[PDB]
């Protein structure tokens, strides 16, 4: 997230979760993971208030 | 503070809410479930709860 | 429908029965009615049957892992003391009839009854909310029955034979009625190729264009080269559904049911599924699937393979005793040798077992079972694990049919107890994860129709292609389906193939691949401009209903339950 | 064959039994008679080899 | 003994030749006794007449196609097997079919001999091309049930005969379904439902009556061992 | 035409006698069909339990009921028959 | 017997079910001969509870010892030594199944041995210095009664061992056709059998007492318990199996127990079984039964229930048990005797009065309407509260015994108690839908259908099958032990005669001399790890003798051509048939069914209680709330939370509306929320509910 | 088309067994007739069996009689094996009463006129020198299987012990077809059915009753057209 951007961290999280879920033959659509990934990136830190 | 208190670490959440004097607006699934009010999802939203149903004019006159 | 014991139903519906039998003048007042109900008078039962008409009840089985764990059924009275459950909803409830119990709840108010009839009816929840694959589909016995019914056997009695120089064609029937009359006389088998004239089944979307230039209307006659079982199965399907003429594996039936759900109303799909269940149950008992000691055969080359691998292991051990080896190297070599022996034994068993074997019929049809279980039952048990999680250099070379020794059984007990102890911890961790996910994503609720946002998410359809053919990605059914495009699909020599706002589907993906487009920009909830929650267009197609997601539906809970439900079967490696 | 009156039941066993099954309730009766200090426990302890039965 | 309630039979028309007979109430377990026996008797007891073998002029050795007509041998055979015919003589009889010139050959072009009649004069048989002829000789026998195509009974005396399967029974398809009903706190009485489809040469009610009569004759033959034994009396 | 006549099915039994898809076409969404039916059933039930000697305000069942048909069933039948109208809030 | 031989790792000074990881719940290689690795609970206590082995002893210091045979110079001696784990590690122990010569010399140079860390290896015969006693040394008592144990998976064996302890006693018991030999000892040492003390002859034998004369000249009288209630409600009675004048010997069984036939353990019945699907009634582990079991009382058990009521000494008055019962009809008290209790042998239905007790009520202010009614009808208002004992919901039977305790009769009653009467109700329960049946191999399943005699598929001889099992459940669970048991059971109850002409058959070279022929209805014994093999079983199947008609119904593959009961057409393919010994488990719908419309409520929080005995409701947990939220049904969730659980006014208003046929009122505020608010204010937290204006809303409405 | 009507013949195998042959029959029709006859024989053949007993000194089933080796439950289980034929519609009463040492069998029961016991050799109970047995039984007619009728429903006394009744006198029925009858074609079945009874009624009477019931059913199935 710090180096590349907010897009690459979302891609990485979705891909890493799907790799674990696809290894056991379980089909889950990405829109279910995307809600959880969205809920994890809703806040920012304050350094120059 | 109600959902956070119901979720985990009740003592710390209650202490922080008491110190901050936070106000709960009661808009959520868990908060409305706790107090017995209709949840703001599905049929509990204002669009669907305020439906007015009346017989049509043709059936009103025919019957 | 569900079966409800009469005593339990009387206890649940006690106030309704009291009111109704007071109205019918069977009791003078409320106290007399209550006394009559408690005494269980003969006239109570008629009132009870009158009052449970069209009054849905909810059946729930703990644990409730997803939405389909609570469904509404229409009650019925039975003599016994056990709740009768439909066999097609066992998969939805994850229930097996070996001592399981279910709880029944009674809605009271008008809103609760309306919600039970419309939202939570068992006929309206056929498709999973997670992946969209159907759950109320034939399985186990029904799949085996349909597989036996629809398969084809060469050389069967009364098969089709080409015309010779002295005799005409043998095996041509003028109607399926004559075919049924013939098999009852023993001159025909349901698994023999014939040519039967059909007048009530639609042509398979290929012969229709060749024969009927305008179209196929009921009463038109055409000649089909199939088997009587496939004719019966296509009679089970709706009238306007084209003739299939395929062997009905589990995947084939899943595809057919998905197509029916996409093209036909849900009531038609429910009726078709019920008919398929009835036919599968009727034909499953005549499939001749039995388990016997003789049917559990062993390969003849198993002994030679075991002898050769034992000789190799003895040579390795002798080399180790000479000092030119290490314990770790010897263990690794033994593990590799025994794994190769197990693979060879499994291949030999698979080759030796006839295709008509009941075990092979069960395994291959997709009902249940695995190749590993079949190998374990007949052949070599394979490598075993220490209680600390380490492969043992000495495997179990004796199958269960032959009979294990004392120490091999001891090691098997080690492994089984380890697995049983690990399963509970895995399930508890899955439950905790599901709880956290549900409690996190609860404010994600659809609030609007469209947020009018140009942003999106890049999704790849084809990566390279072996020679520019643009081979479809193997994971496109869970990345690009049920999403709405953000920008028009433009390729070289810019032409608008798919317009903005078009819900992607299989035809859309096929058109995009045929036009030379590899990537698309689909809208997703990650980049949404809605003030509160998400909107309908960004979320896209709902995986359960099959259409656009309704406004006000709680999607966070659905997503959390879908993610956390497959936690018990997620074995750590 | 140890039990005097037993129903006849042909067996597939191929190995001679060197030792008969011990009493299945000794695990508690022997412990309790040790706790009380019965005479039979005293005799068993004396025969088994001991220094001071208590 | 006496039955609790006398069963009743009703008819429900479904099409021009079809019905859905319902028998209820029945004692628990008698529905399956009645259903399969009635189905078998309906299918293989009723006598009838059907085409046994045919000989097509111009096709002697190679049974592949008939020149001058669009339909080949197989389609003509399939069309002829669906012809309904009632014969009065038990011995086999021979019919003729002659058509000259282009047109559509229907079942009404067949000349019926004495005692032989057809019930569907509007059945399509073959479509002749321009300047074509079609002469087919049909043999009609009488019997019951469905008998497969018996091979030639001669060692080469006749070569043009084409044996075909014979559907003697006027009833084509019978399917029976048994359900459960309740009378007085008894959810075990069985209700029998029979769906019978027949040709136009007989009505389904007549077929059911004939099957019932034959079954009554059979079980009366079984009954004559002791006519004064205690049984279950239905009533009036 | 088979495609035009795709709405062919056997006679529905019991709780599914009004086809769900036709009801959905009548209303706007499954939620604003549950509310529709519930409010109509409440109006019908208030009509049944009305005093009779007061003022008649709530309209009774616009369709002919059965012997002991539930008010919700009558409401659903009226909805399927295009005998009512609603306005969302 | 299993409970008396249990090893528990929980309690004071031990582990706990929560503070125990996957380190102690494993089978250490030192459990061989000291603790059974199969028998253990399958719930949360897996691995923390086990059972002793058959041969295990206990050291004086508290260690567990097991016997081994000392072998020196490759010759097995006849001296048995008991070695603990520490003494076993130093030595090397061989296998009990290793072949031996007539003297003890090992025939093979390679012998399976166990080293210090297990290390199962082959060593020379001279290195061996110890040997096991029997192949079944590692198993416990319960696990040693499962035939063909080695062919079953460990999970299936565990489930079979656990379910084998839940069988109920039947009216008449029958020993299994195929056993393991650990049934005489288990029955004798269990303690529920009667064992003669000294040899002699039987003088008087009756259903309630047995008198045995002795050679010394001493008469022994044995009292037999008849229909005595056990701890779990089952019936335990003893019946003699001896006759007057018969000569008995010391140690011989005289009277059977509940589950015993001629001194052998017998927990179930031998039923003809067919392995085939049948119209979907046996789908997903269900079982189809014949009506002959119900008609002939094959699977019938007797259950005895005890009801007790006490009339203690109260502060406000004295409690007296008598048939006053001020407010009843006249027909209710027909069965009561002069003292106000039912008569012995009088059948009691649900709601009937068993014991009539009237307790003082005290001075209470009756409502004016009640006073007016009592004045009009003349029924005087006496300060008495009716506390008559009634049969609980869903129970019935026949009264068999009444015991009355009184303080004045010099009885050690607890202080403050004056009268105490206990009434026993006996009931016979036949098999029915919902009852659970299971075998010895871990195959369980509820009964989903009981077909009549005629509908069951029948053998060509005409014998209908009694139980039908699904085919798909066998291959996916690895329990071919049940198939082998079925084959051997069919061989057992058919008689066999091996054709020894022209030489002994090759497959029967190792068979004992007494197994070459056996009559019909014979019994066989298959020990746990040393019993019948596949080849011998196949040979016995192929060499059975025909029935009375001179024909063989089952061919060499163990399959038969079953007909169809309801169609008459034979099944197109042969179906496996045979006799399987099944058990009736103690999971009956008569005890599991539960329902509630309105019952008791708790005190601190106004919520319904829990439990069948307390007439409580079913818990609507958090997961069900998540499911309801996911569906979108807000109103059902609101009603379930408020007006069925906590809304105090809401409950009574809903009940009145339902009775009167009006509309269900709008829910209010649950009492649990107010309890939470009062608990928060007790922690010096100023929780206040604000309205739209901003002023607080009082919660003291009333 | 064959005009040869089927005929039925009987051959005896034992005293209580018989074998009946029906021929000729149409192909595919031998099995169904045999199945219908077997179901009717096993389901709707009337008979007679006991329904209630009353021992002298007992009040319920769960007790024991002094001086008797078998308790009341075992006596009731043994009494269910009696084969008794009655020709009187209303219930009759039989009496059993033996005193002193001996073995009580089915031969000690004295039945009234019109009621007989066909197995005077079964075992009921055994008595020592101090035992007396006096039990009266009730015999009623019917068919099928009827469970116990409770005292509350029947309004009986306390000493009356209801007993389950099995009125069916048929033990085992099977059938087999031959397909050997030839007149002009070799595809005609030949039904062969085996009937065995409990000696209460001869197999001929059982087959006649089954034929009568099926005649009534298949006649009402055609007369109401
Ligand atoms: Mg389960
Ligand atoms: Zn958006």
Swiss-Prot record, chain A:
Family membership: Belongs to the RNA polymerase beta' chain family.
Cited function: DNA-dependent RNA polymerase catalyzes the transcription of DNA into RNA using the four ribonucleoside triphosphates as substrates.
Source domain of life: Bacteria
Subunit note: The RNAP catalytic core consists of 2 alpha, 1 beta, 1 beta' and 1 omega subunit. When a sigma factor is associated with the core the holoenzyme is formed, which can initiate transcription.
Protein name per its UniProtKB record: DNA-directed RNA polymerase subunit beta'
Curated annotation (Swiss-Prot), chain E:
Keyword DNA-binding carried by entry: no
Region (Alpha N-terminal domain (alpha-NTD)): 1-226
UniProt KW keywords: DNA-directed RNA polymerase, Nucleotidyltransferase, Transcription, Transferase
Reactions performed catalytically: RNA(n) + a ribonucleoside 5'-triphosphate = RNA(n+1) + diphosphate
GO biological process terms, semicolon-separated: DNA-templated transcription
Domain of life: Bacteria
Secretion signal span: none
Molecular function GO terms recorded: DNA binding; DNA-directed RNA polymerase activity; protein dimerization activity
EC number(s) stated in the UniProt entry for this protein: 2.7.7.6
Keyword Nucleotidyltransferase on entry: yes
GO cellular component: cytoplasm; DNA-directed RNA polymerase complex
Enzyme class of the recorded protein, top EC level: transferase
Purpose: DNA-dependent RNA polymerase catalyzes the transcription of DNA into RNA using the four ribonucleoside triphosphates as substrates.
Family classification: Belongs to the RNA polymerase alpha chain family.
Written domain comment of the UniProt record: The N-terminal domain is essential for RNAP assembly and basal transcription, whereas the C-terminal domain is involved in interaction with transcriptional regulators and with upstream promoter elements.
Subunit architecture: Homodimer. The RNAP catalytic core consists of 2 alpha, 1 beta, 1 beta' and 1 omega subunit. When a sigma factor is associated with the core the holoenzyme is formed, which can initiate transcription.
Record's protein name: DNA-directed RNA polymerase subunit alpha
Organism: Mycolicibacterium smegmatis (strain ATCC 700084 / mc(2)155)
Curated annotation (Swiss-Prot), chain F:
Cellular component, GO, one term: DNA-directed RNA polymerase complex
Top-rank EC class of the record's enzyme: transferase
Transmembrane segments: none
Keyword annotations of the record: DNA-directed RNA polymerase, Nucleotidyltransferase, Transcription, Transferase
EC id: 2.7.7.6
UniProt GO BP: DNA-templated transcription
Recorded catalytic activity of this chain's protein: RNA(n) + a ribonucleoside 5'-triphosphate = RNA(n+1) + diphosphate
Role noted for this protein: Promotes RNA polymerase assembly. Latches the N- and C-terminal regions of the beta' subunit thereby facilitating its interaction with the beta and alpha subunits.
Family statement drawn from the similarity comment of this UniProt entry: Belongs to the RNA polymerase subunit omega family.
Protein name: DNA-directed RNA polymerase subunit omega
Species this protein is from: Mycolicibacterium smegmatis (strain ATCC 700084 / mc(2)155) (Mycobacterium smegmatis)
Gene label: rpoZ
Swiss-Prot record, chain G:
Reactions performed catalytically: RNA(n) + a ribonucleoside 5'-triphosphate = RNA(n+1) + diphosphate
GO biological process, one term: DNA-templated transcription
Outcome after substituting residue 10 to P: Rifampicin (Rif) resistant
Cellular component per GO, a single term: DNA-directed RNA polymerase complex
UniProt enzyme class: transferase
GO molecular function: DNA binding; DNA-directed RNA polymerase activity; ribonucleoside binding
Enzyme Commission number(s) from the entry: 2.7.7.6
Keywords, comma-separated and alphabetical: Antibiotic resistance, DNA-directed RNA polymerase, Nucleotidyltransferase, Transcription, Transferase
Subunit-level organization: The RNAP catalytic core consists of 2 alpha, 1 beta, 1 beta' and 1 omega subunit. When a sigma factor is associated with the core the holoenzyme is formed, which can initiate transcription. Interacts with RbpA, which partially restores Rif-inhibited transcription.
Function: DNA-dependent RNA polymerase catalyzes the transcription of DNA into RNA using the four ribonucleoside triphosphates as substrates. This subunit often mutates to generate rifampicin (Rif) resistance. Interaction with RbpA partially restores Rif-inhibited transcription; once the subunit is Rif-resistant however RbpA no longer stimulates transcription.
Note: Mutations in the RRDR sequence (residues 423-449) confer rifampicin (Rif) resistance. Rif blocks transcription initiation but not elongation.
Family label: Belongs to the RNA polymerase beta chain family.
Entry protein name: DNA-directed RNA polymerase subunit beta
Gene (name only): rpoB
Residues of the full protein shown: 440 to 1141 of 1169
């Amino acid at each position: 997230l710090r180096v590349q951007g907010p897009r690459e961290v979302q891609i990485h999280l979705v891909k890493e979760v799907q790799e674990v879920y696809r290894a056991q033959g379980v089909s889950i659509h990405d829109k279910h993971i995307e809600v959880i990934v969205r809920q994890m990136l809703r806040r920012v830190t304050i350094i120059d208030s | 503070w109600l959902s956070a208190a119901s979720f985990q670490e009740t003592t710390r959440v209650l202490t922080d809410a008491a110190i901050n004097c936070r106000s709960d607006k009661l808009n959520g699934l868990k908060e409305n479930v706790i107090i017995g009010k209709l949840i703001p999802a599905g049929t509990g939203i204002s669009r669907y709860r305020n439906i007015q149903v009346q017989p049509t004019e043709e059936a009103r006159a025919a019957a | 429908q569900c079966g409800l014991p009469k005593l339990m139903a009387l206890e649940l519906f006690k106030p309704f029965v009291m009111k109704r039998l007071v109205d019918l003048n069977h009791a003078q007042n409320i106290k007399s009615a209550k006394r009559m109900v408690e005494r269980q008078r003969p006239q109570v039962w008629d009132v009870l049957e009158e009052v449970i008409a069209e009054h849905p009840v909810l059946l729930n089985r703990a644990p409730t892992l997803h939405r389909l764990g609570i469904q509404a059924f229409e009650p019925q009275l039975v003599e016994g003391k056990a709740i009768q459950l439909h066999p097609l909803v066992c998969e939805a409830f994850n229930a097996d009839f070996d001592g399981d119990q279910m709880a029944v709840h009674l809605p009271l108010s008008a809103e609760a009854q309306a919600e039970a009839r419309i939202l939570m009816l068992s006929s309206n929840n056929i498709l999973s909310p997670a992946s969209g694959k159907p759950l109320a589909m034939p399985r186990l016995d029904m799949v085996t029955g349909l597989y036996y019914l629809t398969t084809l056997v060469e050389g069967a009695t009364g098969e089709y034979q080409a015309a010779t120089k002295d005799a005409p064609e043998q095996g041509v029937y003028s109607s399926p009625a004559e075919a049924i009359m013939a098999m009852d006389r023993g001159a025909l088998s349901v698994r023999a190729k014939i040519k039967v004239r059909l007048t009530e089944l639609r042509p398979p979307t290929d012969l229709e264009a060749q024969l009927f230039e305008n179209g196929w209307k009921p009463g038109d006659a055409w000649t089909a080269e199939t088997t009587l079982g496939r004719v019966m199965f296509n009679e089970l399907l709706p009238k306007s559904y084209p003739f299939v003429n395929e062997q009905m594996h589990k995947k084939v039936q899943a595809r057919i049911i998905n197509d029916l759900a996409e093209r036909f109303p849900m009531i038609v799909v429910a009726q078709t599924v019920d008919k398929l269940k009835d036919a599968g149950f009727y034909w499953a008992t005549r499939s001749g699937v039995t388990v016997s000691m003789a049917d559990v055969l062993v390969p003849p080359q198993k002994q030679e393979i075991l002898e050769r691998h034992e000789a190799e292991a003895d040579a390795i051990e002798r080399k180790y005793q000479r000092g030119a080896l290490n314990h770790t190297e010897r263990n690794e070599s033994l593990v590799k040798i025994w794994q190769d022996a197990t693979e060879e034994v499994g291949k030999a068993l698979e080759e030796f077992y006839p295709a008509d074997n009941p075990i092979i019929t069960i395994v291959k049809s997709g009902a249940t079972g695995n190749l590993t279980q079949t190998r374990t039952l007949a052949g070599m048990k394979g490598l075993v694990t220490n209680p600390k999680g380490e492969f043992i250099p000495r495997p179990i070379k004796s199958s269960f049919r032959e009979g294990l020794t004392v120490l091999e059984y001891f090691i098997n007990t080690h492994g089984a107890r380890k697995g049983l102890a690990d399963t509970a911890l895995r399930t508890a961790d899955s439950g905790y994860l599901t709880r956290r996910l549900v409690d996190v994503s609860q404010d994600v609720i659809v609030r609007e129709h469209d947020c009018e946002t140009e942003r999106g998410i890049n999704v790849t359809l084809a990566e390279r292609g072996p020679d520019g053919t643009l081979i479809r990605d193997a994971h496109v059914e869970t990345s690009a389906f049920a999403r709405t495009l953000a920008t028009d699909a433009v390729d070289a020599n810019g032409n608008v193939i798919i317009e903005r706002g078009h819900d992607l589907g299989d035809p859309a993906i096929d058109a995009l691949l045929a036009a030379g487009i590899t990537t698309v920009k689909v809208r997703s909830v990650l980049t949404c401009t809605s003030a509160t929650g998400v909107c309908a267009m960004c979320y896209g197609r709902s995986m359960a209903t099959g259409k656009l997601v309704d406004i006000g539906e709680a999607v966070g809970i659905v997503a959390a339950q879908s993610i956390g439900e497959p936690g018990t079967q997620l074995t750590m490696r | 064959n140890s039990v005097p009156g037993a129903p006849n039941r042909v067996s597939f066993a191929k190995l001679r039994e060197p030792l008969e099954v011990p009493g299945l309730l000794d695990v508690q009766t022997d412990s309790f008679e040790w706790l009380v200090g019965s005479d039979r426990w005293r005799q068993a302890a004396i025969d088994r080899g001991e220094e001071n039965p208590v | 003994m006496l039955i609790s309630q006398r069963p009743t039979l009703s008819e429900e028309t479904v099409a021009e030749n079809r019905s859905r007979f319902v028998i209820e109430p029945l004692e628990p377990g008698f529905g399956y006794t009645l259903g399969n026996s009635l189905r078998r008797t309906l299918l293989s007891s009723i006598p009838g007449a059907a085409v046994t073998s045919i000989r097509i002029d111009g096709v002697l050795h190679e049974f592949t196609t008939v020149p001058g007509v669009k339909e080949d041998v197989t389609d003509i055979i399939l069309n002829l097997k669906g012809l309904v015919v009632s014969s009065d003589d038990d011995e086999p009889v021979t019919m003729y079919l002659r058509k000259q010139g282009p047109g559509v050959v229907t079942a009404g072009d067949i000349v019926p001999p004495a005692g032989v009649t057809v019930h569907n004069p509007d059945m399509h048989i073959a479509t002749l091309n321009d300047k074509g002829k079609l002469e087919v000789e049909l043999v009609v026998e009488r019997g019951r049930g469905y008998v497969p195509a018996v091979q030639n009974k001669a060692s080469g005396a006749e070569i043009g005969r084409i044996p075909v399967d014979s559907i003697y029974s006027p009833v084509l398809k019978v399917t029976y379904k048994v359900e459960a009903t309740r009378v007085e706190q008894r959810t075990d009485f069985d209700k029998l439902i029979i769906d019978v489809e027949t040709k136009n040469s007989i009505s389904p009610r007549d077929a059911l009556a004939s099957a019932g009569g034959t079954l009554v004759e059979l079980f009366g033959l079984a009954r004559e061992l002791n006519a004064d034994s205690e049984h279950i009396e239905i009533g009036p | 035409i088979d495609s035009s006549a795709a709405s062919a099915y056997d006679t529905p039994l019991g709780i599914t006698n009004p086809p769900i898809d036709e009801l959905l076409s009548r209303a706007s969404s499954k939620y604003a069909l549950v509310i529709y039916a519930a409010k109509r059933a409440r109006q019908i039930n208030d009509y049944y339990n009305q005093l009779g000697d007061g003022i008649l305000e709530y309209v009774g069942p616009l369709v002919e009921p059965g012997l002991q048909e539930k008010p919700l069933s009558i409401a659903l039948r009226e909805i399927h028959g295009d005998l009512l109208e609603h306005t969302e809030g | 017997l299993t409970h008396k031989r249990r090893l528990s790792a929980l309690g004071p000074g031990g582990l706990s079910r929560e503070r125990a990881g996957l380190e102690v719940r494993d089978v250490h290689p030192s459990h061989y001969g000291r603790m059974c690795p199969i028998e253990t609970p399958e719930g949360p206590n897996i691995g923390l509870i086990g059972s002793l082995s058959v041969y295990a002893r206990v050291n004086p210091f508290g260690f567990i010892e097991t016997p081994y045979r000392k072998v020196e110079n490759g010759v097995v001696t006849d001296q048995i030594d008991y070695l603990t784990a520490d003494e076993e590690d130093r030595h090397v122990v061989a296998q009990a199944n290793s072949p031996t010569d007539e003297n003890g010399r090992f025939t093979e140079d390679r012998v399976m041995v166990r080293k210090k860390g297990g290390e199962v290896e082959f060593v020379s015969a001279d290195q061996v210095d110890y040997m096991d006693v029997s192949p079944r040394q590692m198993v416990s008592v319960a696990t040693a009664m499962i035939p063909f144990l080695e062919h079953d998976d460990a999970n299936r064996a565990l489930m079979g061992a656990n379910m084998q302890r839940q069988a109920v006693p039947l009216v008449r018991s029958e020993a299994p056709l195929v056993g393991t030999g650990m049934e005489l000892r288990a029955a004798i040492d269990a303690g529920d059998v009667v064992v003669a003390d000294k040899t002699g002859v039987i003088e008087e034998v009756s259903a309630d007492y047995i008198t045995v004369m002795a050679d010394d000249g001493t008469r022994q009288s044995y009292r037999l318990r008849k229909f005595a209630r056990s701890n779990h409600g089952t019936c335990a009675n003893q019946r003699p199996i001896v006759d007057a004048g018969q000569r008995v010997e010391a140690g011989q069984v005289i009277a059977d127990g509940p589950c015993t036939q001629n001194g052998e353990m017998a927990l179930g019945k031998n039923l003809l079984v067919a392995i085939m699907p049948w119209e979907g009634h046996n789908y997903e582990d269900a079982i189809i039964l014949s009506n002959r079991l119900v008609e002939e009382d094959v699977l019938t058990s007797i259950h005895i229930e005890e009801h007790e009521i006490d009339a203690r000494d109260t502060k406000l008055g004295a409690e007296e048990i008598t048939r006053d019962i001020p407010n009843v009809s006249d027909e209710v008290l027909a069965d009561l005797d002069e003292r106000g209790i039912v008569r012995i042998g009088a059948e009691v239905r649900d709601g009937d009065i068993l014991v009539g007790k009237v307790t003082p009520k005290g001075e209470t202010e009756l409502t004016p309407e009640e006073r007016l009614l009592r004045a009009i009808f003349g029924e005087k208002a006496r300060e008495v509260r009716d506390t008559s004992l009634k049969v609980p919901h869903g129970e019935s039977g026949k009264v068999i015994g009444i015991r009355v305790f009184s303080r004045e009769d010099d009885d050690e009653l607890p202080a403050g108690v004056n009268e105490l009467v206990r009434v026993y109700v006996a009931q016979k329960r036949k098999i029915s839908d919902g009852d659970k049946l299971a075998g010895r191999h871990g195959n369980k399943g509820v009964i989903g259908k009981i077909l009549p005699v005629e509908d069951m598929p029948f053998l060509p001889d005409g014998t209908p099958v009694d139980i039908i099992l699904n085919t798909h459940g066998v291959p996916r669970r690895m329990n071919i032990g049940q198939i082998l048991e079925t084959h051997l059971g069919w061989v057992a109850k058919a008689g066999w005669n091996i054709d020894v002409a022209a030489g002994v058959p090759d497959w029967a070279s190792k068979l004992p001399e007494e197994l070459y022929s056996a009559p019909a209805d014979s019994t066989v014994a298959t020990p746990v790890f040393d019993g019948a093999q596949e080849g011998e079983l196949a040979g016995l199947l192929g060499s059975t003798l025909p029935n009375r008609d001179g024909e063989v119904m089952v061919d060499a593959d163990g399959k038969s051509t079953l007909f169809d009961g309801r169609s008459g057409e034979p099944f197109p393919y042969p179906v496996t048939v045979g006799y399987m010994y099944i058990l009736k488990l103690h999971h009956l719908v008569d005890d599991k069914i539960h329902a509630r419309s309105t019952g008791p409520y708790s005190m601190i929080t106004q919520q319904p209680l829990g439990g069948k005995a307390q007439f409580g409701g079913q818990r609507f947990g958090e997961m069900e709330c998540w499911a309801m939220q996911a569906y979108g049904a807000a109103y059902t969730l609101q009603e379930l939370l408020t007006i069925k659980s906590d809304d105090t006014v809401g409950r009574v208003k809903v009940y009145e509306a339902i009775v009167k046929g009006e509309n269900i009122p709008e829910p209010g505020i649950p009492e649990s929320f107010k309890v939470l608010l009062k608990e928060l204010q007790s922690l010096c937290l100023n929780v206040e509910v604000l309205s739209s204006d901003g002023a607080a809303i009082e919660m003291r409405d009333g």
